[PDB]
Symmetry: C3
Subunit: 414 residues, 3 copies
């Protein structure tokens, strides 16, 4: 809970919690305040439960895109680092921890998709998407393919579609304009067109998923793939002489991958907000702190400028940061749920031929507002029923509103 | 019974309708136009039924908050008192009778919660909320409690919550901005926290409702309660030496109770709009008009400045007008229905520990703004339902 | 089919498609490119289905209001006629073919309601609505009625209602503000009030529909009726000595009838965008082009200034254009579905006495918006049912294609 006089930290099991515990000991040595690090199962699901009743950890570690939902439910304390501390980190990461004007977390690490290439098949990676078709028929002559990446998930296909001017929601002040959606502009249109052309000219298969794209690259069957820092360990094992580099340009514009930021938030119910802020600002977000965490489990690229420059000596890490700098910070707003489902269908339908490019993307725009507001209404029936639970004396699994009558007037009058 | 050459007035049975008929005989004397006053059952429900077909009274009396829904359905005629008539009343009472720029009703009487205290247990009432925890323990030593009021309805708990900067919807031009909700700001957050602190520090019970809060004050078991002019008649009966005063301040700010304004609206279907406006401006909203109504039933505080000053000699009425002047005029808009159910759940959950202050209020701004889809959904279903039952049968 | 190297044109079967095919042969003579005009059943429903999968015609002919939904679904190619070609047509017709700033089609013909009168019963038609009461009494003495028109649908009753300031959605920049509805203002209030007054003063029956209104005018029972260019051929057969003129003014303001504009849109999937724009701009939208189409089946008033002035020799056509120029261009946006349903009820309720004018209108202004927001949420539940269609199929293409 609160944990008055101490600090309890939740961080996912797959991270460097042992390294974080070691910063905890260093903090315990100069202050006498003991730090407890734990990694419960599905802590991103548990936090919304316990924090709503004033319990839980003092500080939570998760990808920034979950925090928008938390801050909306008032579960995170507004943080106030002064200007001096802010300049210690990359200015773009602060934009990943801002919910409606307010700063609600500290950025730790940075993730983004990169171009991963087989050095032995490709001496040098293309700087340009446009030259991939030419490159594929050069490698096909050797029974090899140029590129294979997951086409089923928008996360992977977005970098291209967004390249010439697409975007999820327009951001211009720490606040996302939810009626300015850019899935239906000329830039996005140009991007998805190129992608569909790649599939229909047989340079790519419409059924390529994560597993198939990973198996092909790790068996040296394909020259290139698009993936993030979590996929590297498997390529090390495959013994593929691989490189990680900046994504290819399209129509002269860099690709725009989604940027996910590991963030540290303070529970709005913690009485140890001061302790937590001193721990994060002066012990963890330091070269010595991140180093200790990194040693246990690599963070990839980090938000702190000083330690990032030390980690950039690895050209894989330097490439993940450079991609992220030219990429699009993933909106933390609830309307993103709609965007995922809409663009998923728009890409799958354009790819298979079921729909055209212009139609698939135009339908997504409508599906964005339609599915997005639906979530607001779904919360209304879910809050009206929830009020009834606490009034009388899984269970909420009800949800009626099934009256959508379609009036079809007979416009005959001849 | 469309009227035509006569005035038929509607007003609730609990009001000075016999005093109103006395002004209606006065009008009949200088005009030869007979005034009929009636008080049918659930008139506030019947009025929208009959007015939508072009029937019912020429003029209607009810709290200003119901008038928003009426004027939205276009059942009220616009009124035009000139600059001279408007300055006879308190400026703020005109803000209660404004529906999207247009004035639709004449303000009559003003209602707000006040601090009612036992003079025999409390010499001077506390000017400050912050000092009540200290006053309770001083009274717990004697087997008494400092304060007990209804914690179940947000009408009673709002004064405190809104004190430091909370508000329902932002008003700034005879028009409410329905996207500017103030249940989740630092003002509301500071207020509700204080209220919950009281409950967990056992200066208050989470299960205190209207009945329990009234019983306790009327048996002298508690030194203070918060209530309105309607409860006065029961405290007289209990023989408690009581006082009515301005509500305590919080963080230096005055408490902000909701303001209910009893108002007179003219039926849009009434052929007697001119007669009505003459009766209301020149006969009823005068010292003698309101007196006649008041002698039948007390209005409490009144909108007319002149007659308010004569009534102000009662310190109970004097405090009601002070509280109402520092309070918030209850929005007349349909989005208020959402506000009631959401803030009500928010306070209940915060008090019982089921949810924190920050969490209950942040999810209150969702429930209240998200119940607006009910407005469009339930109104669109229900709207189309009427046409279904007409086209299909 | 596909289209590559030719043109395929879709137009409704009640138009001059043979005359359109005749423009098609003239094009084929100078170019060699074959033009195939076809008129399939319910083509305005078939077009969204085939155009979404990249099929259908190169060019499509329909009333402009249907194109909003097409351009929203991205089924129409943005057209670019230069300032020189744009000035050959009436400026107001271009506004009927703008979807959110972009031009999506070519204007062909214009259609609006007009006052149609029996010159044997009425020598000179009234310029004023206000005088129809007095005129009725004068004709009632002879066992005739002054005016009889379809009161059931708003399309017909709108001209009056809108006359003094009523409007569907405010339009100011090729873009409709859907929060600015005008069915509740003083203008609309005044118009419907006048209509209600006519019905309760028994100058008009609340149950007059299209069929009753048409029969009455064509049996010489009523002196006047409002209607459009489509009802003319029935009046010719009735042997009624009739005229067609400008609609009566209310409170000194002209009646605002809804403007329907026949339009030519280019499929965004068509490989022959340059061919189609060459056909339309320089072969069809010319004196000789529309003339060939007109001779097969009349277009009524036309968007091209030059040929319109030759057609204006007919006073009927000259008046359809004059009514259209003072009227309101029908919004092409999806919120118009809700507009029709809300105003249809509002009028029927106010006329039957079931509701007052103030109530029935202020209900419509809230109802039309309430259905509009539902419309978006219905293309949602159904669009989530594309998962039912798809996610079931890609599971049966996976359980069935791996035949157990
Ligand atoms: Ca624990
Ligand atoms: Ca500092
Ligand atoms: Ca170092
Ligand atoms: Ca080192
Ligand atoms: Ca390790
Ligand atoms: Ca009666
Ligand atoms: Ca005066
Ligand atoms: Ca004492
Ligand atoms: Ca009495
Ligand atoms: Ca065919
Ligand atoms: Zn664990
Ligand atoms: Zn190729
Ligand atoms: Zn140190
Ligand atoms: Zn009664
Ligand atoms: Zn205490
Ligand atoms: Zn046919
Ligand atoms: Zn008459």
């Amino acid at each position: 809970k609160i944990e008055e006089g101490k600090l309890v930290i939740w961080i996912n099991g797959d991270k460097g919690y042992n390294g974080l515990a070691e910063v905890g000991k260093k903090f315990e040595k100069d202050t006498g305040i003991k730090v407890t690090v734990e990694h419960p199962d599905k802590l991103e699901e548990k936090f919304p439960q316990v924090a709503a009743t004033g319990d839980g950890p003092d500080i939570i570690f998760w990808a920034h895109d979950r925090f928008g939902g938390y801050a909306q439910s008032g579960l995170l304390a507004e943080i106030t680092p002064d200007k001096a501390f802010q300049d210690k980190l990359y200015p773009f990461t602060w934009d990943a921890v801002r919910y409606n004007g307010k700063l609600i977390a500290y950025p730790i690490a940075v993730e983004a998709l990169s171009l991963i290439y087989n050095k032995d098949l490709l001496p040098n990676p293309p700087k340009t998407w446009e030259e991939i078709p030419a490159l594929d028929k050069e490698l096909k002559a050797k029974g090899k393919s140029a590129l294979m990446f997951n086409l089923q998930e928008p996360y992977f296909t977005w970098p291209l579609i967004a390249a010439d001017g697409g975007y999820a929601f327009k951001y211009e002040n720490g606040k996302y304009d939810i009626k300015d959606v850019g899935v239906d502009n000329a830039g996005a249109k140009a991007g998805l067109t190129f992608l569909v052309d790649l599939i229909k000219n047989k340079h790519m298969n419409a059924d390529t998923d994560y597993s198939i794209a990973e198996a092909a690259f790790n068996k040296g069957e394909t020259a290139m793939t698009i993936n993030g820092p979590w996929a590297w360990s498997n390529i090390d094992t495959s013994k593929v002489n691989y490189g990680v580099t900046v994504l290819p340009t399209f129509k002269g514009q860099p690709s725009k991958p989604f940027v996910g930021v590991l963030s540290a938030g303070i529970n709005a119910a913690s009485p140890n907000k001061e302790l937590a802020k001193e721990f994060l600002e002066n012990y963890l977000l330091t070269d010595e702190g991140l180093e200790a965490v990194n040693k246990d489990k690599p963070l990839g690229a980090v938000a702190l400028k000083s330690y990032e420059e030390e980690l950039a000596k690895d050209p894989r890490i330097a490439a993940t940061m450079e991609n992220a700098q030219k990429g699009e910070i993933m909106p933390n707003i609830p309307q993103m749920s709609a965007f995922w489902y809409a663009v998923r269908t728009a890409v799958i339908n354009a790819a298979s031929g079921r729909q055209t490019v212009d139609a698939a993307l135009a339908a997504a725009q409508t599906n964005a507002a339609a599915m997005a507001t639906l979530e607001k209404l779904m919360k209304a029936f879910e809050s009206l029923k929830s009020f009834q639970q606490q009034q009388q004396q899984q269970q909420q699994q009800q949800q009626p509103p099934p009256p959508p009558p379609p009036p079809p007037p007979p416009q005959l009058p001849q």
